[PDB]
């Protein structure tokens, strides 16, 4: 299948009580393998997955150096952005950055991302061609012009198209057992009676990886929606995910409805009927 590597940076400014908090997390597919906390005693890039721990001490020293340098960047960004919007010093503001790379099943480059956020809104983002910028408002336009002249997009474009893809491939091979695996969901169905006249049917999918899955409700072979409830996919806490779908059915009509599951772990889309 298609794999991706993404880095998420969050920097929040605390006016008064110290410096800004900086959190960095790295994901390959839906697995987190690295983290950095500005308030952590280690003050180093720590491993969160077993397959990354087998890296040499040279790797960690380099990764620790760059994440700390990026942390200093966003603290300056917070001050610069506060000037841009004429905002008061007393307020606490958040800056977030996300960049990532996509590879296809063939393991070659597919897509790239570079996006910036201030106070929960899009600020400046790199287009999919990796050569143009989108500016949200006037304040974003000031940063766009500087970045266009300095050829920042070209330096970034080199990283996603080349540097990430090489390291993403390296990460996949090093943890082939952990992240190149596919776990089929463990499906079952439950019955809940709201009242004498209508009952609730629950479709469960559990212990599956990757997180992406599709759950559909069909009545008599007809797609059933708007009468159904769907929850956000949840992490089980052991590297597997969970999701469930529910539909309200009148009594005696339970056998009409069917649950259809589509996941990469399943060679055939599963069908669940209450009987």
């Amino acid at each position: 299948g298609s794999h991706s590597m993404r880095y998420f940076f969050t920097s929040v400014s605390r006016p008064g009580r110290g410096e800004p908090r900086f959190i960095a997390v790295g994901y390959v597919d839906d697995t987190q393998f690295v983290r950095f906390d500005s308030d952590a005693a280690s003050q180093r890039m720590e491993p969160r997955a077993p397959w990354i721990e087998q890296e040499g001490p040279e790797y960690w020293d380099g990764e620790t150096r760059k994440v700390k340098a990026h942390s200093q960047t966003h603290r300056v960004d917070l001050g610069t952005l506060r000037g841009y919007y004429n905002q008061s010093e007393a307020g606490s503001h958040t800056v977030q950055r996300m960049y990532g790379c996509d590879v296809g099943s063939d393991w070659r480059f597919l897509r790239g991302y570079h996006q910036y956020a201030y106070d929960g809104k899009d600020y400046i983002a790199l287009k999919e061609d990796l050569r143009s910028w989108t500016a949200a408002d006037m304040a974003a336009q000031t940063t766009k012009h500087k970045w266009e002249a300095a050829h920042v997009a070209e330096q970034l474009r080199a990283y996603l198209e080349g540097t990430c893809v090489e390291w993403l491939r390296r990460y996949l091979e090093n943890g082939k057992e952990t992240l190149q695996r596919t776990d089929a969901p463990k499906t079952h169905m439950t019955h809940h009676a709201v009242s004498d006249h209508e009952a609730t049917l629950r479709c469960w999918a559990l212990s599956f990886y990757p997180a992406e899955i599709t759950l559909t409700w069909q009545r008599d072979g007809e797609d059933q929606t708007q009468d159904t409830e769907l929850v956000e996919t949840r992490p089980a806490g052991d590297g597997t995910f969970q999701k469930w779908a529910a539909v309200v059915v009148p009594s005696g009509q339970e056998q009409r409805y069917t649950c259809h599951v589509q996941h990469e772990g399943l060679p055939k889309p599963l069908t669940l009927r209450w009987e």
């Binding site: 760059k66 994440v67 960047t73 960004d77 920042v152 970034l156 990430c164």
Partner: peptide, 9 residues
């Protein structure tokens, strides 16, 4: 691998 290039807004 973290981004090797540094930028400022």
């Amino acid at each position: 691998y973290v981004l090797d290039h540094l930028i400022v807004v």
